[model samples]
Target: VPMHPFVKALQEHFTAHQNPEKAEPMARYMKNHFLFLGIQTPERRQLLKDIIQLPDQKDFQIIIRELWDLPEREFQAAALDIMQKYKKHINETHIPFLEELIVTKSWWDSVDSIVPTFLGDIFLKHPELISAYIPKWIASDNIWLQRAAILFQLKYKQKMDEELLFWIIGQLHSSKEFFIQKAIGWVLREYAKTNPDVVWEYVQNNELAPLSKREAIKHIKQNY
Candidate 1:
């Protein structure tokens, strides 16, 4: 696929700014699943800020799609940055596209961040999608999709669908996957900030995985 003009320029910027020193370690951090352009976060953000939005940026969505398909992990990260920039322009219609991003090239670095910023905000805006689609995701064999289902409501706090959160965790209660257990803990820990009693009581009574239990109470007040 032909690269989008914006992505083409951004690629130039990434290529020019290569920090070869950080590339191997960064790639190692992600288990070498992808090649790094050697762009670190500070420099990446600076480059992200420099990419001026164009007048005819209606092709912006197309640009992101091409970016997501690129072999380098930073390009997908840039795709996410652009999606967040244009989030107001995205809606229920784009849920499928977001899901594609989730399952394709799935990983903790990408999906974990995407869950809260993209899916969480999207679900908040159009909650109907939660009931409509998240169950299918949870039921999918894809571990990342299951993780997405568990973590999508991470920032909802008082607005969170508490019942749904419990149910989804219960559905994954038997899961041995590290990501699912960690996600289970993460959502509970976050929700605990809003309602400590409920999380504490639930964690105490339920036979949660060790990792999940530990994470859920990491911030809970000690011994009541």
Candidate 2:
């Protein structure tokens, strides 16, 4: 069988891997992803990237459509797989694509997976482009996008772009998003490892959400 045939066969393998009892939950997740992607150009770009429908767009286009039709959270693992495959290709070209994913049908589950893992790594590898695109995400009207922008640097911790983090913290401070609040703390928590003093001072001075402060100070209070 050819690559197309092989992919179809593998679909069964993928389907078999899903937890049947969790079908509804999975659907909800995918629905969220589809919702965020919007039925538009960003969606088309994702289709082009994932399915890469070549040799004419007919054969693999439906696969892209089907995947988009499914729930976003349902494809969480699959997104991870796709990012893994495209890890090397992430660059300025991917900024808007990722922003779309986080904004259109975004949630804590999906955004968290994409941000620090894929986007964070991408930013690390391409620091120059990072600043230009990230400000847009962090300052966006969408709370989820802002959160992803803030926390994408979590993995960078001590080496984090402190200025960007502080900037986002200020922008999202007024937000009521539970996830965003948690992310603020989570990002700060990681930074604490690099310099507890700065984290402590920031935590004290900044008007962080209760959850943000709680998560950020959890270790510091306990260990110190």
Candidate 3:
């Protein structure tokens, strides 16, 4: 019932996803953003394990609390897998439930990744349905959603909405949060991969934290 052994067989595969060298790259920045919200509760832990294998997933509200040293790629991949598995099972209705994860520890690492890839696109696809709630996130002052408001669309590529994006960045141009600034810049940098001309001009004219600009330029700028 626990799916313990089957999941255990995947542990080696999961372990392969982590490398001390790779973790080192993220370690220093991880201190503040790392969180342990569900490691102690057995009920929640087992719940997550069982929920993943559920026959009727209509009740999709059960991610058990557990400790995981989730690698960025691995975690994002897992989240995507859930969507495909539950394709007909889930709907735009699940967006708000996912929003709850954004403020869990109010950390950027978790929420930022989830926002752009997970919630960001979800809201976009269903804007007509989630319209009322989407703008409210911009106004909530929950730094995660605020950052998400800008960063999530990084993957929009040709569908990029410049006008909507300028509005989001304007709201945070003067804020002092390192993560928020980083998110804005990172989003721009990523988008540049698809549209450098627009991103180049957009970032230059915009004001943001120094780290934000520095990171946004890391890939775009040529060698020393």
Q: Model 1, 176: alpha-carbon shift in Å?
A: 0.8
TM-scores, all candidates, are: 0.94, 0.73, 0.65
Clashing pairs in 1: none
- What are the lDDT scores of the predictions, listed in order? 0.85, 0.65, 0.58
Candidate 1 Cα deviation (angstroms), residue 14: 1.0
**Candidate with best TM-score:** 1
What local lDDT score does residue 186 receive in model 2, on the 0 to 100 scale? 87
Top candidate when judged by lDDT against the true structure: 1
Model 3 CA deviation exceeding 4 Å by range: 1-53, 63-84, 129-131, 221-224
lDDT of 1 at 84: 73
lDDT at 224, model 2: 50
Taking the tens digit of each residue's C-alpha lDDT, what string does model 3 give over 20-105? 55444454555634422222223333433553554346433342111122333233334334444555654577777667656654
| Model 1, CA-based lDDT | 0.85
Query: Using lDDT as the measure, what is the rank order of every candidate, best first?
Result: 1, 2, 3
Give, for candidate 2, the lowest lDDT window spanning 10 residues.
32-41
